[PDB]
Design a protein around this ligand. Structure first.
Ligand SMILES: [NH3+]CC1CCCCC1
Ligand SMILES: [Ca+2]
Length: 223
């Protein structure tokens, strides 16, 4: 996250870290046994880390649960990043409490102008690199669809939205991928892609989760 603030330990209780010997992507706990992330984060051998603040220190609220199954969206296109969403089932159910909690799925798509919370452990610099070890937070509005198609001509599908600032300076960044965009207490987006980080007229692009709610429900009802 670029130009954000330190969230504070366990203040974003649905935030997970996907680990394969190192943190490589964020994710969101949607019930005690299922995580949703970005399909471009797909990897074999995922361990899900819950209750994290400092990802390099065991602080006491962590639960490390390995994944038993990963399901990439059946129409994921890695070239265009359309349908960049994946479900991960935990081998056993997480123990839910004030610091490890699931986030609700939307019953409605969020509108442009809605302020949201984006969070993750990704790069905090738009030019160069510096990875934080504690979770970083950023409040950003959903952008109108026409300013989104104007920043990314020919690249925005109906399954994507832009969120952030056309002046730049604040944005999600590498390593924030798969992470949550929560608006009004509901998961509305997944950190998906963009052109660099915090650049002028190049806002973050996010998977539009409200389009996938029935695929998510049906898939967890059957797996
Ligand atoms: N600024 C958008 C970021 C670009 C890196 C990958 C996640 C999304
Ligand atoms: Ca830790």
């Amino acid at each position: 996250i670029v130009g954000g603030y330190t969230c504070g330990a366990n203040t974003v209780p649905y935030q997970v870290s996907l680990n394969s010997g190192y943190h490589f992507c964020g994710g969101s706990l949607i019930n005690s046994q299922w995580v949703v992330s970005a399909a471009h984060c797909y990897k074999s051998g995922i361990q899900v880390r819950l209750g994290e603040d400092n990802i390099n220190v065991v602080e006491g609220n962590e639960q490390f649960i390995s994944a038993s199954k990963s399901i990439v969206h059946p129409s994921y296109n890695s070239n265009t990043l359309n349908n960049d969403i994946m479900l991960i089932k935990l081998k056993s159910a997480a123990s839910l409490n004030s610091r490890v909690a699931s986030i609700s799925l939307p019953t409605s798509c969020a509108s442009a102008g809605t302020q949201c919370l984006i969070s993750g452990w990704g790069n905090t610099k738009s030019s160069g690199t510096s990875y934080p070890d504690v979770l970083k937070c950023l409040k950003a509005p959903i952008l109108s669809d026409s300013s989104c198609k104007s920043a990314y001509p020919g690249q925005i599908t109906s399954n994507m939205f832009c969120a952030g600032y056309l002046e730049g300076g604040k944005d999600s960044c590498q390593g924030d991928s798969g992470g949550p965009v929560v608006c009004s207490g509901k998961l509305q987006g997944i950190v998906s892609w963009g052109s660099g980080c915090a650049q002028k007229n190049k806002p973050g692009v996010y998977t539009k989760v409200c389009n996938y709610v029935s695929w998510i429900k049906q898939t967890i009802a059957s797996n």
